[PDB]
Structures are given as C-alpha cells and as structure tokens.
Design a protein around this motif. Structure first.
Motif, PDB file in Angstrom:
ATOM      1  N   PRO B 328     -10.792  -3.863   7.751  1.00 23.96           N
ATOM      2  CA  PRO B 328     -10.289  -4.617   6.621  1.00 23.96           C
ATOM      3  C   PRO B 328      -9.043  -3.984   6.101  1.00 23.96           C
ATOM      4  N   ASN B 469      12.465  -6.588  -1.751  1.00 21.86           N
ATOM      5  CA  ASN B 469      12.660  -6.966  -3.119  1.00 21.86           C
ATOM      6  C   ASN B 469      13.112  -5.786  -3.931  1.00 21.86           C
ATOM      7  N   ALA B 491      -1.804  -2.380   3.243  1.00 17.82           N
ATOM      8  CA  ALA B 491      -2.222  -2.803   1.940  1.00 17.82           C
ATOM      9  C   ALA B 491      -2.000  -1.664   1.001  1.00 17.82           C
ATOM     10  CB  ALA B 491      -3.710  -3.205   1.897  1.00 17.82           C
ATOM     11  N   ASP B 492      -2.320  -0.434   1.434  1.00 18.12           N
ATOM     12  CA  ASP B 492      -1.985   0.704   0.639  1.00 18.12           C
ATOM     13  C   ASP B 492      -0.503   0.893   0.554  1.00 18.12           C
TER      14      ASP B 492
END
Lengths: 544, 544
Positions: B328, B469, B491-492
């Motif tokens: 995950p 960004n 994700a980290d």
C-alpha cells in the motif's frame, strides 16, 4: 431587501443564483433570443444541496423575480386524495399551468411525489410516480412553465425523472462559501442595530465569519437571532421594569459587536446532526508538557486553518492528520480535547466503539456516515479515539464482517476524502501494532506522534499545573517532587496530588494547605506506572 | 411535431425505427397485399429501454403519418375515477377505437395500467389489469388499432400482456449506435446553426460526436441544448446591454465548434446513475513514476477505446481487466483516478463499503444494478477499490449472507459481460490473498499488476512532479535526494516536501524556496515506509 422575497433579497448564492438566472430566468424574459437561436429552454430544475437550507426560499423569490404566474403546490396534498383522484389532482394543476403559462410551477420535496422508480412497491406511489413522469412526457413546449423542486437526496427521485429530458436541468446548490457568508450575513444585518455605519462592522462581520467555517445559511441567520436574544438579555433587567411598553428605549436599544462575539460561541455550530457532543474546557495553553509535540501538533492543525494564505505561499498540500501513540496513561484524550477546544473550525468526535456497535443494519453505512457528515461539515477535524478499536489489522487472515464492514470501509472512506476538504484526522492508539498498517500508511496520517513518557522536568510543569487549583504551602516545593519521582506517569501524578488530599484530610479534619509530607505518604501510597518494559516496547516500536 | 413529426423527424433510432415501420406501419398502409396473402398483422407494441427517450416520439410520429387516430390517454387518469367507472373508462376508449379504426390508441406507462401480475393487493389494480387483458382478447381485426405504450419494467404486466397475440411485437429501443448519434444531432442542427452549416463543420461535428462514446437519445439532445446554453454565455456580456433585442445579431451569433467541445466536458455523463461518482482532477502527465506500468495500463485501457479499428485488426477481445496490487502507499487510487480522467469512456468507481451495506432487502441487487447500468452505459471502465473488502474468499464461511450476496454476485456479474459490454475492470487491493481466488482467475481479470516499489530513478520523476508546484531553490539538488533514499515511499515523499516547508516556515516566516537542508532535517523527520519483508511476501504471492 424591502420586498417580500426577491432577487435583492437573495444573496451569497451569486454563483448558484447565477445558475438560476442564467438557466430559467433568461429565456423567460426575452423569448426573442432563443426564438432566433436554436433549442428549447429547460422545463424544470431540481435543487440539490444541504437539506432545506432555506431551499424553498431560494425558489420562493421566483415569485417576484419573473412575473411568471405563481404556482406553488406542495408535495403532501398532491398524493392525499381518495384513491386515484390524486393523479387527476396533479394533472389538474398542470393543465391550469398551461393555461396560465408562463408559470412558476413550484413543488418541493419532490421526492415525496417522486419516490424510487421501482424500488418502492406502493400502488399509489407508483401511480403518481408514473403520472408525474407522464406529466413530463405528453409535453407541450407551450408549457413555458418551469418546474422547480428540491429534495433531500439526489437520487431519491425516480431515476427516470433524472433523465436529460425529464428534468433535464439540474442544479446543486453548495454549502455557504466563506467569502459568500458575508453577503448572507449582510442581508440579515440590514434589519437590526449594527454598531454605526461601521465599515468596522463590515470588517467585523468579515472576520467573524472567518472565525469559523460558518454554519448553514439558516444557521447563519440563527446566529443573528442569537445576537438578538443575547442582547435582549443585556436589556432584560432594564426593559423588564414595567408591563406596558416603554418607548424611550425602543430606539435606544443598541446591539453592538460584543453581543455577536458572545453569540459566536454558545450558538450550536452544528451544521447538522446530533453528532458533536460537549467537551470540557481547557485550552492548548492550559495543557502542559510535550512542548515539542505541541509546537508541531499546533502547527499542523492551526497553520492551514488560521493562516491559509501562507500555506498557499508554500503550495504544499496541507497535512491530513496525525496519530497519537504512546504508553497508555498519557491521557491521550486530554491532548486531543485541547486541540478541539481552541480550534477555530469545529471538531467532530465520534467515539470508535459507538460506531462499531452502531445499528443502522449494523452496517458500515455508519462509518461512512461519519465521513459523509464530516465532508459536508468541512473545514473540520474528525477525531477517532482508539482507532485500534475501530481497526485492527486488515492483515487478519480470518475476516468477519467486523473486518469486512467497518475496518476495510474505514480505509476506503478515509481514502474517500474530498481532497480539498479541510478534514483533519486526529487518530489515537495505544498499541500501534494492532491496527492495519494501511492506516499507518500516509495519506491518512501525515505525522506519527510518539508520546514519550514525561521526564522529571516535564513532570515539573505538569505537576505545577496539576496543583495549580490546589492550595500549596511554603513547606512544599515543587522541584523536590519532580526530583522525587520520574517513574510516575501523568495519570498517576494526577491521582498523586489527589491522594495527597486524602492523606491530608485524615491528618487535619479542618482543611489545611498541603505539606511535603502530604506528598511523601501519597508517594508511598500510589506506585509509579512508567515501566521501563513498556517504554522499551514503544521505544523499539518507534523504529517502525 | 409542430413542424409535422414524420418518420424523418425521428432519427438515430433508424435501425430500430425500421422495425416499427416494417412491423406496424406497413400492413396498416396497404393491407390489401397481406389481406390477399398474408398474416394477421401485429396489434400492440411495448417499448422497453431508457424512458421517454424517444418512446413518445416514436408514437408521436405515427400520429401525423397514417390516419390512425392518435389517442393519448395516460395511465394515471384512466384508473383514478369514482369506483367501478374507472374500469369503464378503458372500455369506452376501446369501443371508440372500434368505431373509428384504424386508430393509434396510445396509452403509455403500461406499468401503471398494468402494475403487476397478481402481486399487488389492489382491488382496482387487479380490476383494470384483468379488464385490459380482456380488452386485448375482445378484439376485432377491423380494430387494426395499434396500441403503443412504453414501460421501464419489462414485466410489470401480467405475463398475458406479453404473450404473443397480446402485444405480440415488442420492440426495445436502447442507447444509440455511434453513427446513429449523428442523425439525432444532425436533425437538431436544422433548428440551430453552428455558424451557418458548413459541410466541413458537419463532418467535424460528426466525428466530434464520435469523440464521445455515447449518450442516450434524450441526452444527445441535451448536449445540443447545452451548446445553446454555453453559447448564450459566450454572448452574455454583449446581450445584457440590450433590453430591446437587436436584429443585427439575432442569428448572426455563431455557436462555435469549440463551444460544442467545451460543452462536451461538463455535460451529464449518463442519463441514469447520473449520481454516478464525484470528480477527480489529475492529468496523465501528472502520473509520475511507474512509467512501465503506465505504458502497459494505458495500452490496456486506451487501446480498445482509442482505435477500435486497429483492435479488430488484432481480433483479440478487449483485455478482461487487471488488478493493482503491491505494498500500500503506492497511492493505488491515484493511478486509477488518472486513467479514468483521460479516458473517453465512463468511469465507474464504487467504493466497497458503500455497496457492502447495500443489501436492499438483504439483497445484493444494488451491486447487480451497478453492473446492469454499467452494461447499459458501456463502453466504460469500472474501478473497484479494495476489491478484497467486497470479495473475501469463499474459503471463509464465517459469514451469514455476506459472501453469498456480494462475492457470488460479483462473480456472476463479471461473467455477466458481453463482448460489446466494454466494461473494464481496474482492480485495486492491498493484499491479494484476502480476495476470493475465483476473482483472481482469468476472465475475472486479465493481468495481475504487481506494483514494484518506487525505484530511485522513478523517485526522481515522482519527485520532480511533486515539487513542480513548490517554489524550488537553486540550493536543492533533486537528483541527490532521489539517490539519498529509496525506502521512503512516494506517499511519504509527498509529506517529505510538505515537512520541508514546515521547517522552512518555522525558520523564516517569510516564505523562501526550499533548501537541501530543508529536505535533510525532514528526511529524518519522516522515516521509510517500505518494508522488504512484506514486499517479498507480495512478490512471492504473485506466484499464487
């Protein structure tokens, strides 16, 4: 404004109202436009949004906003009649609509007259459903009548009636945006004492509105009512001097900005639901210890909310939450309660066991309803206390519906987050290992807060705080007690100061402020609780 | 309609319309032929499919096309009236048919005039149904009276009204064919120019329309209405100025091709289950990392959709689907959401828990309806997130109906496909093993995507995308950090860049671009997430 209910009344909805205008109002005024260029206009619009958010009142101003003949009908009486005369009832109004066209056919809660297509078995229900469907179908375009309707659930209506034809045009009306609120409050202010001309009040209302995520439009207006009530308390003794009405004060009634300030709190912020229950007071300043954790926990929650602007200046996505984990008896909840008290945007707390027992079929529909409610109420902080209790390992090889229903749903629903939503997850668990590591995967939590046990030095500060209420004596000195025990947890030092009293009351029946001895005896009554064995567990599990 | 509705008015349904023509219209015109040698003609037709879409329009075009007197009555008002005279209403119309034959006796919503077989407890309900049965039976041939009517329930009627010799011919009309769409929109072009016409534009609009897989007849027409609306926005700044409309621009407004294209985004997707899903926003470029996965996943979804022709040249049936599995925190859902954003075909996303509490009378029928609608709206890509959560193994029987209901329905529904049902299964699960292996069989998936964890080289690409960004300093060396750590998931690394900011804001409240150090401190604030013990588990589990 002055009008019964008209365009000038409506406001804050300018985007959404801009839908209404731009959709039905425009053709209705000059047909010349559409007459020259193509297609037929809409025949109706369904207003989706936070339930009955003055739902009706929006459409209620299409009563002076168009000059199309008024033609309200309301759901209950439409289906009432002595069997099968209900259907002819509808049609009768409908014909009277064509006669009086252009007409604002206004029926609301149209779910009532529009149940599910086939998922309701009711005869009459299916009678009227079919009829309404057909009342759309026989169609004369000459029915330059608009049909407005609102509902509590988008799909409550017959899915057939959703079609891009039958109720082709569809309108969702959103939650009051912060910048939008001002407009809303602005109309509601022009009926009662402000503070003066008060550009300052306009600004007050601005920051007032920013002080919270706001409440529903109705609720915003209820806020103004609160102010009234509150200010009427202020004038309650003065006014209540006589049974006849004094006219001296009758314009020498003045409501001012502080009243509003006292109303902002202690008006139920509850956008909806019985969800959200009172929490005891305590502010982040009033909680002691873990200055580091505080500095970060605060900066995670407070920064996006208190200062959005600088966070956009970063351009990094706000953190979505954090987990609190440590040895039990660090009073996890107290840290948590603090963040919720101060929080400028309301916090939502639904305790874990409650949801896992929640009867709504014993369904995961409950966990999902937490999030659902949260999503609507966002910017908000959802709190899950004992996230372990609601979620063990999904790595559990033997799955029940305990796991299937809620635990997995929890995952998918947290993942379910509407990204923009200012939901913040304050998780807590005693033993991290018990949960499914997917919750320990990012996106959910963004920080993992290990709670180290309090050192003597931090004990000193918590201790000072704990005896702050209590009456100390010159005999006691706090740095002594700090140096006395380090192995004490916070939960025990709580009871320590308590137990000191129990001892003390025994010593002198008449009350006296505490002594070193009152602590000593109590030192020997209760035990330390920080076990180097459990700390080693967490210390090592922080490697994970 | 007003400009006489004739065969040529109806369009797009031409294949189907050719049924109607050839079935009822032909004998009705020159019966002499069939009279001399030939059958007893048809006498009733039921139109099954998405309602009113053309239902009415079909019979409305028989109205002004054959001297068969159109004779609309609609179900609700026929049965409403004062008891026992409701039944005679029907009888009167039938008799009035026999006098005036040939006559197109038209009642629609055949369900309301024939709700159930016997299932309803309604007296009158059973009265009128039986009568109608008999009204079919009493028939005189001379009564060539065709009876058109439509329903959304194929079986509401008593089986008797199905039975050949009673509404013998039954014609279902459904979602158009791609080529058919043109006819519909083309017909609507006669009511509104795109600028004038321009055979070039027409051909453009033709393929434009094929650029969207489909809509229903109604929806197609709504698309054109949208265009109108959209273009009226375009002329809105100029229009407002006028109170008496100028003839100078009155049809010298131009509904530009780009308008159509822009209506094409943000038009209702599917007529039914328009509730459908929410909205993502990621663009395919923004999917960073897993370039390989992208290359294969893209070619699986995109190919059937982007060029059908070359895919028929292969002659292989479209890919059955694929599952995504890995550790995950590869943000499975984001990969999925992306493919769906760009894809021309519909996305269906049904989160597992929502459906799983949907047991609509202890009935899985809701999941079955998901697929049912999907089947209708095909080609489409269904996404099942936590497919495990809705599909535990049948090797576990620690359930009541839980597995039985959904997992087997899932099965039968995956089996439920037709080649033309271009449903495509994008699976995601954290752990394959929880899932029922029957779903892990071929046909119930085509490929098994193991997600290899982010490689250093891929970290760089996800990282560049992630800091795109963010204000970037010349101080940072991005390839450095990529090469610095790998055990840290994507994700980290999201949160990494986040935390870097937190550090930066803390240092300087004035927001300066992130530095190498801002990453370093934060590097050690976060910790890795990828654990090689579990990766080996999944890597090996790709065997089973």
């Amino acid at each position: 404004e002055v009008s019964r209910i008209s365009y000038e009344d409506i406001g804050g909805l300018s985007e959404q109202l801009g839908k209404i205008r731009e959709m039905i109002e425009l053709p209705l005024k000059h047909p010349e436009l559409f007459e020259r260029l193509g297609i037929t206009p809409p025949k109706g619009v369904i207003l989706y949004g936070p339930p009955g958010t003055g739902k009706t009142l929006i459409a209620r101003a299409v009563a002076n906003e168009s000059g199309a003949n008024f033609l309200s009908i309301n759901g209950p009486e439409i289906m009432s009649k002595y069997y099968g005369q209900s259907e002819q009832k509808l049609r009768e109004i409908f014909s009277k609509a064509e006669e009086t066209a252009p007409s604002i056919i206004f029926i609301d809660e149209i779910d009532s007259i529009a149940p599910k297509r086939e998922e309701v078995q009711g005869e009459v229900e299916r009678r009227v459903v079919a009829q309404l469907l057909t009342l759309m179908d026989g169609m004369k375009e000459r029915g330059h009548v608009i049909v407005i309707g609102a509902t509590n659930r988008i799909d409550a209506i017959d899915p057939a009636l959703r079609r891009p034809g039958r109720f082709d045009r569809e309108i969702e009306i959103g939650v009051p945006d912060r910048n939008g609120r001002k407009e809303i409050l602005m109309i509601h202010t022009r009926n009662m004492p402000l503070g003066m001309s008060e550009e300052e009040k306009n600004k007050f209302l601005e920051e007032m509105a920013d002080y919270t995520y706001g409440f529903v439009g109705a609720d915003l207006a209820a806020l103004v009512r609160e102010s009234a009530m509150n200010a009427l308390r202020r004038y309650l003794p003065e006014i209540d001097l006589d049974k006849p009405i004094p006219t001296e004060i009758l314009e020498k009634m003045v409501v001012t900005e502080d009243d509003f300030k006292n109303a902002l709190k202690s008006i139920e912020p509850s956008s909806l639901r019985e969800v959200m229950v009172e929490v005891p007071n305590v502010h982040w300043d009033d909680i002691g210890g873990l200055e580091d954790v505080k500095r970060e926990i605060k900066e995670t929650v407070e920064l996006p909310l208190l200062k959005p602007d600088v966070f956009k200046r970063l351009g990094i996505r706000p953190s979505k939450g954090f987990l609190l984990y440590g040895p039990p008896g660090v009073g996890k909840t107290l840290l948590a309660k603090a963040v919720a008290t101060e929080s400028n945007a309301n916090f939502i707390s639904i305790k874990g066991p409650e949801v896992l027992s929640k009867w709504v079929g014993e369904s995961e529909k409950a966990i999902r309803e937490i999030f659902k409610k949260a999503k609507q109420v966002a910017p908000a902080i959802v709190f899950l206390d004992e996230i372990d209790s609601i979620a063990p390992r999904r790595g559990t090889t033997s799955d029940s519906g305990v796991t299937e229903r809620i635990v997995n749903q929890l995952l998918t629903s947290l993942d379910g987050i509407e990204v923009m939503n200012g939901v913040v997850v304050i998780g807590a668990t005693n033993r991290p290992d018990i949960m499914d590591p997917a919750l320990l995967r990012a996106g959910r939590f963004d920080k993992l807060i290990y709670i180290p046990p309090p050192d003597k030095e931090a004990r000193l500060s918590i201790l000072k705080v704990h005896t702050k209420n209590m009456p100390l004596a010159p005999d006691v000195d706090l740095n002594d007690i700090a140096q006395r025990t380090e192995g004490y947890v916070g939960a025990d030092l709580e009871n320590l100061c308590r137990e000191a009293g129990m001892n003390a009351y025994r010593e002198n029946p008449d009350a006296t402020s505490v002594s070193q001895k009152n602590f000593l005896d109590a030192l020997k009554t209760i035990r330390p609780s920080v076990d180097e064995e459990v700390i080693k567990f967490y210390r090592t599990l922080s490697e994970t």
